[PDB]
Amino acid sequence: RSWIQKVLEQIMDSPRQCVTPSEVVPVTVLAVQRYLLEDEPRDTVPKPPLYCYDVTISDGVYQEKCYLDPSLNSLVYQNILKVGIQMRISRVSCLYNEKRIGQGILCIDNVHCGETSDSISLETPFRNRAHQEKPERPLRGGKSHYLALWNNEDPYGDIWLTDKQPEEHNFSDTKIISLSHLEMTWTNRRNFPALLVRILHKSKLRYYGKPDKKMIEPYQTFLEVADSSGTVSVIMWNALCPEWYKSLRVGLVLLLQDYSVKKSYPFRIQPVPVDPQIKLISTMEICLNLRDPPTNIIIIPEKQVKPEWRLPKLNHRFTTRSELDDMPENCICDVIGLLVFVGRVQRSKKKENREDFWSYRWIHIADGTSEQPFIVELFSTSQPEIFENIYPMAYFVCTQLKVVRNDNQVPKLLYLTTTNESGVFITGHRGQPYTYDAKVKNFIQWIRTKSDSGEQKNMVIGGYYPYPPVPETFSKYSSSIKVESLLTAISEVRKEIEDLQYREQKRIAIQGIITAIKYIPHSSISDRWESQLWREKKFGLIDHLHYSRVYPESIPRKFMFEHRKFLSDQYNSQPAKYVPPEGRPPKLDDFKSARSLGHFEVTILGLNHEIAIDVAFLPMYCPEDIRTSQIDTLLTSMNYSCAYPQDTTGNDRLPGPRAVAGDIIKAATELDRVHIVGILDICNLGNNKVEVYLHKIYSP
Amino acid sequence: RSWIQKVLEQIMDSPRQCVTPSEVVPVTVLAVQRYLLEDEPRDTVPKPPLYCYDVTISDGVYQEKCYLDPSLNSLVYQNILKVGIQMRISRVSCLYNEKRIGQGILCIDNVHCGETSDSISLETPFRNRAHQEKPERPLRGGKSHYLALWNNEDPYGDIWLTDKQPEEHNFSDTKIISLSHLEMTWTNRRNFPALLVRILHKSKLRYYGKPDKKMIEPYQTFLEVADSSGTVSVIMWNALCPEWYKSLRVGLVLLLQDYSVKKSYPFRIQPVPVDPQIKLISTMEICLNLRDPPTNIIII
DNA sequence: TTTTTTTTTTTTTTTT
Secondary structure, X not given: OOHHHHHHHHOOOOXXXXXXXXXXXXXXXXXXXXXXXXXXXXXXXXXXXXXXXXEEEEOOOOEEEEEEOHHHHHHHHOOOOOOXXXXXXXXXXXXXXXXXXXXXXXXXXXXXXXXXXXXXXXXOOEOOHHHOOOOOOOOOOOOOOXXXXXXXXXXXXXXXXXXXXXOOOOOOOOOOOOHHHHHHOOOOOOOOOOEEEEEEEEOOOEEOOOOOOOOOOOEEEEEXXXXXXEEEEEEEOOOOHHHHOOOOOOOOEEEEOOOEEEOOOOOOOOOOOOOOOOOEEEEEEEEEOOOOOOOOOOEEOHHHOOHHHOOOOOOOOEXXXXXXXXXXXXXXXXXXXXXXXXOOOEEEEOOOOOOOEEEEEEEEEEOOOOOOOEEEEEEOOOOHHHHOOOOOOOEEEEEEEEEEEEOOOOOOEEEEXXXXXXOEEEEOOOOOOOOOOHHHHHHHHHHHHHHHOOOOOOOEEOOOOOOOOOOOOHHHHHOOOOHHHHOEOOOOHHHHHHHOOOOEEEEEEEEEEEEEEEEOOOOOOOOEEEOHHHHHHOOOOOEEXXXXXXXXXXXXXXXXXXXXXXXXXXXXXXXXXXXXXOOOOOOOOOOOEOOOOOOEEEEEEEOOOOEEEEEEEOOOOOHHHHHHOOOOOOOOOOOOOOOOOOOOOOOOOOOOHHHHHHHHHHHHHHOOOOOEEEEEEEEEOOOOOEEEEEEEEEOO | OOHXXXXXXXXXXXXXXXXXXXXXXXXXXXXXXXXXXXXXXXXXXXXXXXXXXEEEEEOOXXXXXXXXXXXXXXXXXXXXXXXXXXXXXXXXEEEOOOOOOOOXXXXXXXOOOOOEOOOOOOOOOEOOHXXXXXXXXXXXXXXXXXXXXOOOOOOOOOOOOOOOOOOOOOOOOOOEOXXXXXXXXOOOOOOOOEOOEEEEEEOOOEEOOOOOOOOOOOEEEEEEEEOOOEEEEEEEOHHHHHHXXXXXXXXXXXXXXXXXXXXXXXXXXXXXXXXXXXEEOOOXXXXXXXXXXXXXXXXX
């Protein structure tokens, strides 16, 4: 028999009772689906976690979906409870979903997540066939739905339908009034007639679901649509995004018929159209709510489009690196280029809610117009299939990129960022979606010229990439940070490390003195230096923090199209559901390191000589940068270009890695008893793998 | 040159080590302030004092604000260590504040307080300019502040401002509701509209800064403002008190915006106003925290 | 005592 069935029979007739199971045999996790925790008593002092998770264990005989007790949510937060792990259940309890007629829900009250399972069989049947239903929904609570395991803007599950194709509708007997006319007469007329518009901007999803509120699929997406008489902001309400979101895209002629015109929202701004001729309507807004007969939205095909209507054409503000160099800040633009680098999918905490996160990742889009790549801060645009599976050597096109500039720092910062109404599309060979635009044709011409010339731009994927480089002087660094939180204590650092969540990144500043720096030939005369101060105070340290370890996934690795899937999966966000690995995968140490140096280990003794720490120094600058003076100092972590070397062909005479390592060690030795201000980078790679890499050493 | 300079140069390179000063020269106390003793280990059976003291001993040349070892607070409880006295420091130590960029701090660890000085100079320069920063703050801690020397219900220091003046806020399109309106509708109002209240009673300050919890300006004052017939016990939190307490007098017409509404604190005792005709709303209370823009509190 | 941010809302009259 199966441990699942044994436990179920053991605790089936004692609902909501904590019962240690008779026998504990490891079970295999196969999925972790997240959803909102609702219908629980929030009066409790430890406010219930905002979200709860369902774990789909398997026992070799049957696989059953379990509801993890929210008290254990920290395990999923730190990615300890992965997919395909050998967890052992120490406590179990039953629970009946009164909103449904089914069986008990095995509740995992206590667990001991272990190691990976060598036998991950997804062919096992489901003990409770209700669990194996086509629409994958949460165990508890009416018509509940699942959210993306990490962020709230990524569509996830099966409710997100993608089967809305154009339909031929005859417009005879239809009025299709102009948007300006509607703006004039939306406060008097009763039956708002039809509208023929074209989507010009599609924005990310917005999850406004709150606990203990009678809300069903609380999603809203903002669409800007334009006709021959202006443009308006169209908003899709809950229960409509699931059916239409994955299908609606920019450039689709829609026929909205039964809508609701409201006064518009003052806390949300309407993006300016690419073509200024389009008159902007700001006093009006169109709300699309799900209706009984699904006719409120119709995707009119292009073939039916008549020039007589003169519908506005989807334009684009495509920009090239050279042009971007001359564009003021906050000047929206579009970028088409070749992905020559992709970074980890890091996460940041929303400033509004402490339990929500943004998923972002840095990518160096590049073109033939300049020698520097577009640095784009790619936040999730509710396009997980493209965002998660993005790889170098791909023609990438984003839609709405706000320009961000900072000239105070000596390394002038010029990186683009994705806006709310942005979009991501991967292009293939000649411009697939945007061939007509001349800039796309020029980019394709450059691609062909490079291909026939035998030149290939260097490619990288993943790694430790703290793009924003701290300024050259601590005063300028602190000009933005508050005085009370500017610095921390070497002792308090431990809590900072222990507070981060999956891929949450943090930057802290610590006051101390470099005591001993050691060089670790990383890839496959003096490498260690010790300070007399260290030899004296090493025996009187209260707590010597040891975080000078570099993980294999923090080393950027040169991309290889053949191992594309493996390389991508080694740096994406943790998948929600297990998927068996094709054949055997290679070793993450089997790929060449895009870096060009070995990592050092820096020991810092606090100003009071009581506490110490061991950070790891991971410079990303090549010796050519040293020779041409593209680095503020040898103790920094980035060259000014903030980009990896391209087709390195000039290291024949330049000092080798060992010479640069000796220079770095000597520079560190120059700071013997000097109170320096280190800038550390704390990133938690999940599964209790927190990397603490040094960024900059601000000397007096 | 000076005793201060000699001792500091002697003990700068040995933080958290106790060294008898090379020379013991009487030094005049020119100031004595009191602040919370957080960041100390509360695991010792003799729990360290809830407050520590900073003494601005002055030599003939300079005066450098020092730190009094909490074990010496007995000399201040009896007022034996007062301003204007002459004392002979016997033990010193160097401590570095890890939340500020600055030089070492002299840690007084044993004194022999004598008698009043014959000549006290208030014009002696400050050796360390950091000590001379106009918004005076305690030597230890990041955003710490000095309390009053003896009682905790008296504003003290430069954090307390009196610069607030009446402002002519236009009421062209300001949505002003009544207190009873919130009383009936405050659990459904996603946004709480503006208010136009008038102060009736202003309470004495209350310091709730415990040593272990990390709080900034643990100052809290309860103001009984009454808009229209209704009256509620508004309560200002955190660092809002030392920006509006020395300025707000009873009878000032306040315009509170971007506020919060919650349940009345269980042990709260709302005072009855002079006029009985008013309604004493005692179910919900408006909390005024420091919003990033300075529009939350505007007096008309 | 402490404690912040976010959106959601459907419907049968007028003629002068």
